Amino acid sequence: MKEKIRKKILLAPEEPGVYIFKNKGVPIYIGKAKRLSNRLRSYLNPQTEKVFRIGEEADELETIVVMNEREAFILEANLIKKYRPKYNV
Ligand SMILES: [Mn+2]
Ligand SMILES: [Mn+2]
Ligand SMILES: [Mn+2]
Ligand SMILES: [Mn+2]
Question: What region holds the GIY-YIG domain?
Answer without folding.
Answer: 14-89
